[PDB]
Tab-separated table of N, CA and C in Angstrom:
chain	number	residue	atom	x	y	z
A	1	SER	N	25.945	80.138	17.705
A	1	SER	CA	25.302	79.308	18.723
A	1	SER	C	23.794	79.014	18.331
A	2	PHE	N	22.890	78.765	19.324
A	2	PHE	CA	21.471	78.451	19.094
A	2	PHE	C	20.666	79.679	18.661
A	3	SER	N	19.829	79.511	17.627
A	3	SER	CA	19.015	80.605	17.112
A	3	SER	C	17.570	80.194	16.921
A	4	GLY	N	16.673	81.166	17.062
A	4	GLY	CA	15.253	80.956	16.834
A	4	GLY	C	14.499	80.216	17.918
A	5	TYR	N	15.073	80.142	19.141
A	5	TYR	CA	14.413	79.456	20.235
A	5	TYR	C	13.520	80.386	21.024
A	6	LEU	N	12.465	79.824	21.550
A	6	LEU	CA	11.567	80.531	22.447
A	6	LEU	C	12.052	80.183	23.858
A	7	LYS	N	12.206	81.195	24.710
A	7	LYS	CA	12.647	80.988	26.069
A	7	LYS	C	11.447	80.590	26.921
A	8	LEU	N	11.477	79.417	27.576
A	8	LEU	CA	10.367	79.001	28.436
A	8	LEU	C	10.626	79.404	29.874
A	9	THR	N	11.865	79.174	30.338
A	9	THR	CA	12.283	79.493	31.704
A	9	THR	C	13.702	80.109	31.648
A	10	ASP	N	14.328	80.318	32.811
A	10	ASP	CA	15.667	80.832	32.875
A	10	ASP	C	16.656	79.942	32.085
A	11	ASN	N	16.400	78.612	32.036
A	11	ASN	CA	17.369	77.707	31.411
A	11	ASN	C	16.802	76.784	30.352
A	12	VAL	N	15.496	76.822	30.098
A	12	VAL	CA	14.893	75.928	29.107
A	12	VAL	C	14.401	76.724	27.922
A	13	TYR	N	14.847	76.331	26.721
A	13	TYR	CA	14.513	76.952	25.442
A	13	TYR	C	13.888	75.902	24.535
A	14	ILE	N	13.054	76.327	23.589
A	14	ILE	CA	12.358	75.376	22.724
A	14	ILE	C	12.229	75.907	21.321
A	15	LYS	N	12.286	75.018	20.337
A	15	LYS	CA	12.180	75.409	18.927
A	15	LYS	C	11.547	74.272	18.128
A	16	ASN	N	10.789	74.613	17.082
A	16	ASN	CA	10.206	73.593	16.200
A	16	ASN	C	11.308	73.325	15.186
A	17	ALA	N	12.009	72.201	15.352
A	17	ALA	CA	13.140	71.911	14.489
A	17	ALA	C	13.409	70.417	14.475
A	18	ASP	N	14.066	69.980	13.417
A	18	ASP	CA	14.549	68.636	13.263
A	18	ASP	C	15.879	68.653	14.043
A	19	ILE	N	15.994	67.825	15.088
A	19	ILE	CA	17.198	67.792	15.904
A	19	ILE	C	18.439	67.421	15.103
A	20	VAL	N	18.319	66.604	14.033
A	20	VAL	CA	19.482	66.281	13.183
A	20	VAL	C	19.941	67.526	12.450
A	21	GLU	N	18.993	68.267	11.825
A	21	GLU	CA	19.339	69.492	11.125
A	21	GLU	C	19.876	70.546	12.079
A	22	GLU	N	19.297	70.607	13.274
A	22	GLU	CA	19.747	71.520	14.293
A	22	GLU	C	21.182	71.182	14.734
A	23	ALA	N	21.459	69.897	14.982
A	23	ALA	CA	22.799	69.482	15.371
A	23	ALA	C	23.817	69.781	14.269
A	24	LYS	N	23.508	69.479	12.996
A	24	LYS	CA	24.446	69.786	11.911
A	24	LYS	C	24.724	71.286	11.783
A	25	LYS	N	23.722	72.121	12.067
A	25	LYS	CA	23.844	73.574	11.969
A	25	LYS	C	24.663	74.159	13.127
A	26	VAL	N	24.378	73.706	14.335
A	26	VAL	CA	25.019	74.234	15.514
A	26	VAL	C	26.315	73.549	15.857
A	27	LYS	N	26.356	72.221	15.693
A	27	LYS	CA	27.450	71.331	16.123
A	27	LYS	C	27.694	71.565	17.637
A	28	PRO	N	26.625	71.355	18.461
A	28	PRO	CA	26.730	71.688	19.882
A	28	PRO	C	27.734	70.814	20.587
A	29	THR	N	28.099	71.197	21.819
A	29	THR	CA	29.010	70.345	22.603
A	29	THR	C	28.319	69.000	22.880
A	30	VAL	N	27.015	69.039	23.173
A	30	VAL	CA	26.262	67.848	23.495
A	30	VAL	C	24.941	67.811	22.764
A	31	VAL	N	24.682	66.722	22.062
A	31	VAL	CA	23.376	66.428	21.535
A	31	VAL	C	22.845	65.225	22.333
A	32	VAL	N	21.615	65.293	22.817
A	32	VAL	CA	21.005	64.196	23.539
A	32	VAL	C	20.294	63.277	22.563
A	33	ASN	N	20.525	61.973	22.718
A	33	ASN	CA	19.790	60.989	21.961
A	33	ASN	C	18.732	60.356	22.873
A	34	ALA	N	17.553	60.089	22.303
A	34	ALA	CA	16.472	59.378	22.960
A	34	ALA	C	16.766	57.885	22.775
A	35	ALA	N	17.651	57.405	23.616
A	35	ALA	CA	18.168	56.060	23.522
A	35	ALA	C	17.297	55.016	24.211
A	36	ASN	N	17.526	53.727	23.879
A	36	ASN	CA	16.961	52.641	24.647
A	36	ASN	C	18.173	51.969	25.382
A	37	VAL	N	17.889	51.053	26.311
A	37	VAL	CA	18.948	50.434	27.125
A	37	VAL	C	19.987	49.685	26.322
A	38	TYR	N	19.610	49.212	25.135
A	38	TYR	CA	20.526	48.453	24.276
A	38	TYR	C	21.299	49.333	23.301
A	39	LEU	N	21.024	50.646	23.276
A	39	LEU	CA	21.569	51.554	22.295
A	39	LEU	C	21.296	51.058	20.865
A	40	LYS	N	20.108	50.507	20.643
A	40	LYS	CA	19.714	50.051	19.299
A	40	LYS	C	18.945	51.214	18.696
A	41	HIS	N	19.603	51.977	17.824
A	41	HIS	CA	19.058	53.247	17.302
A	41	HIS	C	18.227	52.989	16.056
A	42	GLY	N	17.071	52.378	16.251
A	42	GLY	CA	16.249	51.931	15.127
A	42	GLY	C	15.317	52.961	14.539
A	43	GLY	N	14.675	53.717	15.389
A	43	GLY	CA	13.675	54.670	14.937
A	43	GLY	C	13.606	55.883	15.823
A	44	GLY	N	12.613	56.733	15.566
A	44	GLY	CA	12.445	57.999	16.282
A	44	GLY	C	13.683	58.867	16.172
A	45	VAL	N	13.963	59.634	17.226
A	45	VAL	CA	15.162	60.465	17.253
A	45	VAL	C	16.446	59.616	17.094
A	46	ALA	N	16.519	58.469	17.785
A	46	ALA	CA	17.741	57.635	17.714
A	46	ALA	C	18.049	57.150	16.300
A	47	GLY	N	17.034	56.676	15.591
A	47	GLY	CA	17.219	56.223	14.216
A	47	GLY	C	17.643	57.355	13.302
A	48	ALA	N	17.066	58.554	13.521
A	48	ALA	CA	17.418	59.698	12.718
A	48	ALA	C	18.833	60.178	13.000
A	49	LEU	N	19.225	60.252	14.285
A	49	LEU	CA	20.601	60.688	14.612
A	49	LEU	C	21.605	59.677	14.064
A	50	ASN	N	21.307	58.383	14.267
A	50	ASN	CA	22.220	57.354	13.788
A	50	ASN	C	22.356	57.391	12.257
A	51	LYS	N	21.220	57.524	11.526
A	51	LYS	CA	21.306	57.590	10.068
A	51	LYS	C	22.157	58.793	9.622
A	52	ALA	N	22.081	59.928	10.356
A	52	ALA	CA	22.902	61.101	10.017
A	52	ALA	C	24.399	60.843	10.179
A	53	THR	N	24.763	59.915	11.099
A	53	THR	CA	26.173	59.542	11.294
A	53	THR	C	26.628	58.429	10.339
A	54	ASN	N	25.784	58.033	9.364
A	54	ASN	CA	26.108	56.968	8.427
A	54	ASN	C	26.340	55.655	9.204
A	55	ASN	N	25.592	55.443	10.306
A	55	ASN	CA	25.645	54.262	11.163
A	55	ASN	C	26.867	54.222	12.093
A	56	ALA	N	27.726	55.254	12.085
A	56	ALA	CA	28.900	55.263	12.973
A	56	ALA	C	28.457	55.276	14.434
A	57	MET	N	27.341	55.949	14.749
A	57	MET	CA	26.809	55.940	16.104
A	57	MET	C	26.444	54.507	16.538
A	58	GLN	N	25.795	53.740	15.649
A	58	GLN	CA	25.417	52.360	15.985
A	58	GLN	C	26.645	51.457	16.170
A	59	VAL	N	27.668	51.638	15.332
A	59	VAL	CA	28.894	50.824	15.454
A	59	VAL	C	29.586	51.121	16.798
A	60	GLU	N	29.680	52.404	17.139
A	60	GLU	CA	30.286	52.782	18.406
A	60	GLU	C	29.446	52.265	19.577
A	61	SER	N	28.105	52.358	19.444
A	61	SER	CA	27.184	51.936	20.478
A	61	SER	C	27.253	50.440	20.722
A	62	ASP	N	27.363	49.633	19.659
A	62	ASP	CA	27.449	48.188	19.839
A	62	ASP	C	28.741	47.807	20.559
A	63	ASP	N	29.850	48.518	20.283
A	63	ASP	CA	31.095	48.266	21.004
A	63	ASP	C	30.898	48.667	22.487
A	64	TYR	N	30.212	49.802	22.747
A	64	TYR	CA	29.957	50.212	24.133
A	64	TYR	C	29.137	49.145	24.886
A	65	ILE	N	28.099	48.590	24.247
A	65	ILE	CA	27.266	47.578	24.883
A	65	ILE	C	28.051	46.277	25.079
A	66	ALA	N	28.862	45.894	24.104
A	66	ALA	CA	29.665	44.671	24.239
A	66	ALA	C	30.596	44.760	25.472
A	67	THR	N	31.109	45.952	25.744
A	67	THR	CA	31.998	46.153	26.889
A	67	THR	C	31.258	46.320	28.220
A	68	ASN	N	30.188	47.113	28.208
A	68	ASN	CA	29.532	47.540	29.443
A	68	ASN	C	28.203	46.932	29.780
A	69	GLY	N	27.542	46.317	28.812
A	69	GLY	CA	26.188	45.827	29.020
A	69	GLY	C	25.204	46.970	28.828
A	70	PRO	N	23.930	46.641	28.966
A	70	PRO	CA	22.901	47.655	28.727
A	70	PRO	C	22.866	48.760	29.765
A	71	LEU	N	22.316	49.897	29.370
A	71	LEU	CA	22.127	51.000	30.306
A	71	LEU	C	20.911	50.662	31.183
A	72	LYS	N	20.653	51.483	32.205
A	72	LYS	CA	19.471	51.338	33.025
A	72	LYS	C	18.433	52.291	32.407
A	73	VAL	N	17.139	51.996	32.566
A	73	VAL	CA	16.096	52.981	32.193
A	73	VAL	C	16.257	54.150	33.197
A	74	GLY	N	16.391	55.360	32.687
A	74	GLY	CA	16.679	56.523	33.528
A	74	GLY	C	18.154	56.890	33.508
A	75	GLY	N	18.992	56.027	32.915
A	75	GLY	CA	20.421	56.252	32.863
A	75	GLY	C	20.916	56.815	31.558
A	76	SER	N	22.226	56.982	31.459
A	76	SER	CA	22.830	57.558	30.282
A	76	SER	C	24.267	57.137	30.108
A	77	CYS	N	24.813	57.430	28.956
A	77	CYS	CA	26.222	57.336	28.710
A	77	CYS	C	26.619	58.404	27.712
A	78	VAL	N	27.863	58.843	27.781
A	78	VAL	CA	28.409	59.832	26.869
A	78	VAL	C	29.244	59.122	25.841
A	79	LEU	N	28.901	59.301	24.594
A	79	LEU	CA	29.658	58.739	23.503
A	79	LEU	C	30.017	59.897	22.530
A	80	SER	N	30.630	59.576	21.397
A	80	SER	CA	30.984	60.591	20.426
A	80	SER	C	29.709	61.180	19.812
A	81	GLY	N	29.808	62.436	19.421
A	81	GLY	CA	28.729	63.103	18.700
A	81	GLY	C	28.912	62.967	17.197
A	82	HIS	N	30.025	62.330	16.755
A	82	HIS	CA	30.289	62.088	15.335
A	82	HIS	C	30.260	63.421	14.549
A	83	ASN	N	29.486	63.502	13.466
A	83	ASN	CA	29.365	64.709	12.655
A	83	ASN	C	28.245	65.654	13.156
A	84	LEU	N	27.642	65.333	14.307
A	84	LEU	CA	26.518	66.082	14.817
A	84	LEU	C	26.869	66.991	15.977
A	85	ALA	N	27.815	66.591	16.806
A	85	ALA	CA	28.117	67.292	18.052
A	85	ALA	C	29.481	66.807	18.544
A	86	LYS	N	30.060	67.456	19.575
A	86	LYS	CA	31.296	66.946	20.150
A	86	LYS	C	30.969	65.567	20.811
A	87	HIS	N	29.889	65.541	21.602
A	87	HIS	CA	29.443	64.353	22.311
A	87	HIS	C	27.986	64.092	22.081
A	88	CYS	N	27.590	62.829	22.224
A	88	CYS	CA	26.205	62.462	22.266
A	88	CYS	C	25.953	61.902	23.645
A	89	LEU	N	24.993	62.496	24.355
A	89	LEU	CA	24.577	61.963	25.634
A	89	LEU	C	23.365	61.082	25.344
A	90	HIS	N	23.557	59.768	25.390
A	90	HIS	CA	22.474	58.813	25.146
A	90	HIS	C	21.708	58.655	26.436
A	91	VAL	N	20.475	59.148	26.481
A	91	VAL	CA	19.672	59.098	27.696
A	91	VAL	C	18.485	58.195	27.492
A	92	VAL	N	18.237	57.272	28.415
A	92	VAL	CA	17.111	56.353	28.335
A	92	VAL	C	15.943	56.825	29.169
A	93	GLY	N	14.938	57.386	28.511
A	93	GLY	CA	13.714	57.707	29.217
A	93	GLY	C	12.844	56.455	29.273
A	94	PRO	N	11.887	56.354	30.204
A	94	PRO	CA	10.976	55.198	30.194
A	94	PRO	C	10.132	55.151	28.923
A	95	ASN	N	9.967	53.950	28.411
A	95	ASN	CA	9.148	53.724	27.253
A	95	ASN	C	7.840	53.202	27.823
A	96	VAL	N	6.813	54.044	27.786
A	96	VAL	CA	5.463	53.731	28.265
A	96	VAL	C	4.866	52.565	27.463
A	97	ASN	N	5.194	52.493	26.172
A	97	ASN	CA	4.746	51.390	25.308
A	97	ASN	C	5.349	50.019	25.723
A	98	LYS	N	6.363	50.005	26.614
A	98	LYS	CA	6.937	48.776	27.177
A	98	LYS	C	6.565	48.626	28.688
A	99	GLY	N	5.616	49.424	29.188
A	99	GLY	CA	5.175	49.394	30.576
A	99	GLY	C	6.174	49.923	31.586
A	100	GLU	N	7.170	50.741	31.124
A	100	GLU	CA	8.181	51.299	32.035
A	100	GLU	C	7.633	52.439	32.912
A	101	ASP	N	8.137	52.513	34.138
A	101	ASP	CA	7.657	53.483	35.106
A	101	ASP	C	7.936	54.924	34.629
A	102	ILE	N	6.853	55.706	34.391
A	102	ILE	CA	6.942	57.107	33.988
A	102	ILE	C	7.689	57.937	35.046
A	103	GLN	N	7.708	57.487	36.334
A	103	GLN	CA	8.454	58.168	37.396
A	103	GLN	C	9.962	58.213	37.094
A	104	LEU	N	10.471	57.297	36.218
A	104	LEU	CA	11.874	57.308	35.814
A	104	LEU	C	12.210	58.449	34.843
A	105	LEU	N	11.182	59.213	34.361
A	105	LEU	CA	11.457	60.311	33.465
A	105	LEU	C	12.262	61.402	34.180
A	106	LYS	N	11.974	61.648	35.488
A	106	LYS	CA	12.764	62.648	36.209
A	106	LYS	C	14.232	62.201	36.316
A	107	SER	N	14.472	60.910	36.637
A	107	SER	CA	15.840	60.380	36.699
A	107	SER	C	16.543	60.529	35.356
A	108	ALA	N	15.813	60.272	34.256
A	108	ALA	CA	16.385	60.440	32.933
A	108	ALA	C	16.830	61.897	32.689
A	109	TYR	N	15.959	62.876	33.038
A	109	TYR	CA	16.325	64.285	32.839
A	109	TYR	C	17.478	64.721	33.744
A	110	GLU	N	17.642	64.071	34.915
A	110	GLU	CA	18.747	64.446	35.815
A	110	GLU	C	20.113	64.275	35.161
A	111	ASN	N	20.201	63.362	34.162
A	111	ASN	CA	21.442	63.212	33.433
A	111	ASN	C	21.866	64.500	32.736
A	112	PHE	N	20.885	65.346	32.330
A	112	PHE	CA	21.217	66.585	31.629
A	112	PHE	C	22.021	67.561	32.518
A	113	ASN	N	21.831	67.454	33.842
A	113	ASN	CA	22.502	68.352	34.788
A	113	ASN	C	24.012	68.201	34.855
A	114	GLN	N	24.548	67.118	34.257
A	114	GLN	CA	25.988	66.943	34.206
A	114	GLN	C	26.634	67.703	33.038
A	115	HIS	N	25.840	68.454	32.230
A	115	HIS	CA	26.333	69.146	31.044
A	115	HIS	C	25.839	70.577	31.083
A	116	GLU	N	26.739	71.556	30.918
A	116	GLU	CA	26.343	72.965	31.028
A	116	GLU	C	25.315	73.386	29.975
A	117	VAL	N	25.398	72.835	28.754
A	117	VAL	CA	24.443	73.162	27.712
A	117	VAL	C	24.219	71.954	26.820
A	118	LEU	N	22.961	71.726	26.453
A	118	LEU	CA	22.626	70.583	25.612
A	118	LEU	C	21.570	70.924	24.586
A	119	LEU	N	21.664	70.280	23.421
A	119	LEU	CA	20.619	70.269	22.395
A	119	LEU	C	19.894	68.938	22.664
A	120	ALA	N	18.567	68.942	22.840
A	120	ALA	CA	17.881	67.726	23.236
A	120	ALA	C	16.508	67.582	22.699
A	121	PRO	N	16.031	66.344	22.606
A	121	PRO	CA	14.612	66.135	22.345
A	121	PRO	C	13.864	66.012	23.696
A	122	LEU	N	12.520	66.001	23.669
A	122	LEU	CA	11.737	65.726	24.868
A	122	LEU	C	11.830	64.237	25.167
A	123	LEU	N	12.336	63.886	26.347
A	123	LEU	CA	12.490	62.483	26.684
A	123	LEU	C	11.175	61.780	26.815
A	124	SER	N	11.148	60.505	26.393
A	124	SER	CA	9.987	59.634	26.449
A	124	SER	C	8.829	60.095	25.562
A	125	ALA	N	9.011	61.137	24.755
A	125	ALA	CA	7.958	61.598	23.857
A	125	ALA	C	8.056	60.728	22.541
A	126	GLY	N	7.184	61.004	21.577
A	126	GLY	CA	7.203	60.292	20.313
A	126	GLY	C	6.910	58.831	20.501
A	127	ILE	N	7.751	57.983	19.856
A	127	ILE	CA	7.520	56.540	19.897
A	127	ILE	C	7.728	55.919	21.282
A	128	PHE	N	8.254	56.692	22.263
A	128	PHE	CA	8.369	56.196	23.634
A	128	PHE	C	7.030	56.242	24.392
A	129	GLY	N	6.017	56.900	23.825
A	129	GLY	CA	4.665	56.832	24.358
A	129	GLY	C	4.209	57.747	25.468
A	130	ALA	N	5.114	58.557	26.037
A	130	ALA	CA	4.682	59.433	27.134
A	130	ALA	C	4.036	60.699	26.574
A	131	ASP	N	3.293	61.413	27.429
A	131	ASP	CA	2.667	62.666	27.040
A	131	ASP	C	3.776	63.720	26.948
A	132	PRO	N	4.016	64.324	25.770
A	132	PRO	CA	5.081	65.335	25.653
A	132	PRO	C	4.886	66.571	26.539
A	133	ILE	N	3.628	66.918	26.858
A	133	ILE	CA	3.375	68.041	27.772
A	133	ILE	C	3.936	67.697	29.170
A	134	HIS	N	3.731	66.441	29.603
A	134	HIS	CA	4.267	65.983	30.871
A	134	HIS	C	5.808	65.979	30.804
A	135	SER	N	6.389	65.516	29.687
A	135	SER	CA	7.838	65.482	29.528
A	135	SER	C	8.449	66.873	29.625
A	136	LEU	N	7.811	67.876	29.011
A	136	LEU	CA	8.323	69.245	29.083
A	136	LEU	C	8.262	69.765	30.517
A	137	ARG	N	7.191	69.430	31.238
A	137	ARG	CA	7.016	69.837	32.627
A	137	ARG	C	8.134	69.234	33.488
A	138	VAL	N	8.394	67.929	33.307
A	138	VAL	CA	9.473	67.266	34.063
A	138	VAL	C	10.820	67.867	33.698
A	139	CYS	N	11.026	68.176	32.413
A	139	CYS	CA	12.240	68.830	31.962
A	139	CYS	C	12.478	70.167	32.692
A	140	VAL	N	11.485	71.065	32.645
A	140	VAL	CA	11.691	72.382	33.257
A	140	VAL	C	11.844	72.271	34.783
A	141	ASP	N	11.190	71.293	35.431
A	141	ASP	CA	11.287	71.111	36.887
A	141	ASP	C	12.500	70.282	37.334
A	142	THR	N	13.265	69.718	36.387
A	142	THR	CA	14.403	68.865	36.747
A	142	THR	C	15.732	69.407	36.275
A	143	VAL	N	15.795	69.852	35.021
A	143	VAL	CA	17.025	70.317	34.424
A	143	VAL	C	17.335	71.736	34.883
A	144	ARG	N	18.542	71.926	35.396
A	144	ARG	CA	19.027	73.228	35.843
A	144	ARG	C	20.036	73.837	34.881
A	145	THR	N	20.628	73.008	34.000
A	145	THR	CA	21.575	73.474	33.007
A	145	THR	C	20.816	73.984	31.764
A	146	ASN	N	21.525	74.571	30.792
A	146	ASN	CA	20.879	75.189	29.637
A	146	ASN	C	20.462	74.160	28.608
A	147	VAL	N	19.147	73.924	28.483
A	147	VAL	CA	18.666	72.906	27.546
A	147	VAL	C	17.868	73.527	26.406
A	148	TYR	N	18.283	73.227	25.171
A	148	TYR	CA	17.668	73.708	23.947
A	148	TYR	C	16.911	72.551	23.356
A	149	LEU	N	15.592	72.573	23.496
A	149	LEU	CA	14.733	71.506	23.046
A	149	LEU	C	14.327	71.679	21.608
A	150	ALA	N	14.526	70.637	20.807
A	150	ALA	CA	14.085	70.617	19.422
A	150	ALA	C	12.841	69.710	19.342
A	151	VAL	N	11.689	70.270	18.931
A	151	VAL	CA	10.450	69.508	18.802
A	151	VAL	C	10.178	69.427	17.324
A	152	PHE	N	10.209	68.213	16.795
A	152	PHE	CA	10.058	68.017	15.353
A	152	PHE	C	8.696	68.430	14.783
A	153	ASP	N	7.626	67.994	15.438
A	153	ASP	CA	6.268	68.236	14.967
A	153	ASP	C	5.791	69.668	15.268
A	154	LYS	N	5.459	70.485	14.226
A	154	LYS	CA	4.973	71.865	14.441
A	154	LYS	C	3.726	71.904	15.303
A	155	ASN	N	2.784	70.994	15.039
A	155	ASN	CA	1.542	70.965	15.790
A	155	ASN	C	1.774	70.675	17.261
A	156	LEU	N	2.705	69.754	17.570
A	156	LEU	CA	3.031	69.461	18.962
A	156	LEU	C	3.775	70.651	19.562
A	157	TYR	N	4.717	71.257	18.825
A	157	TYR	CA	5.430	72.457	19.291
A	157	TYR	C	4.434	73.568	19.725
A	158	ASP	N	3.442	73.833	18.867
A	158	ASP	CA	2.446	74.862	19.174
A	158	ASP	C	1.637	74.516	20.411
A	159	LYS	N	1.252	73.238	20.555
A	159	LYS	CA	0.496	72.783	21.709
A	159	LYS	C	1.342	72.913	22.983
A	160	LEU	N	2.634	72.566	22.892
A	160	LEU	CA	3.545	72.657	24.028
A	160	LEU	C	3.708	74.117	24.472
A	161	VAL	N	3.915	75.035	23.523
A	161	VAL	CA	4.110	76.446	23.880
A	161	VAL	C	2.809	77.059	24.437
A	162	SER	N	1.694	76.838	23.733
A	162	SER	CA	0.416	77.410	24.144
A	162	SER	C	-0.104	76.883	25.456
A	163	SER	N	0.279	75.662	25.854
A	163	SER	CA	-0.183	75.096	27.127
A	163	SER	C	0.850	75.240	28.260
A	164	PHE	N	2.035	75.803	27.974
A	164	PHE	CA	3.093	75.903	28.975
A	164	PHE	C	2.709	76.806	30.126
A	165	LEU	N	2.802	76.257	31.342
A	165	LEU	CA	2.479	77.026	32.531
A	165	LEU	C	3.718	77.848	32.956
């Protein structure tokens, strides 16, 4: 199962790790993708997860969008985890760089509560533009299921742990 995580709360764990490498090592039931409404996995966590699937995630995602239309900001969908996990929970956090309401970050994290355990990134962090310290706070105050957070950047990981209330 999950190794080398620091326990933040009863249900939130954190580790300085590449979520792709973590997913290949663990092969969790659920890996969370930092998705956009179109499921266009171009960069950040989404681009990295998709590249690890040899673009199979993008092919599956385009078929999902052709059938269902775009997701809502704050929403999610469950698709295959391909070679990374049993399932991928594609969750759309608000992208601050697109002027999206940061209040939707709590709605985005609520999607995690439908899964008993997840490997996840911090929603709306990185190229989505939100403050990762705020994202971790919303995560611990919203998610009740077991969430294993992978933070790619060591410097951000240290700042997140050292500032955690």
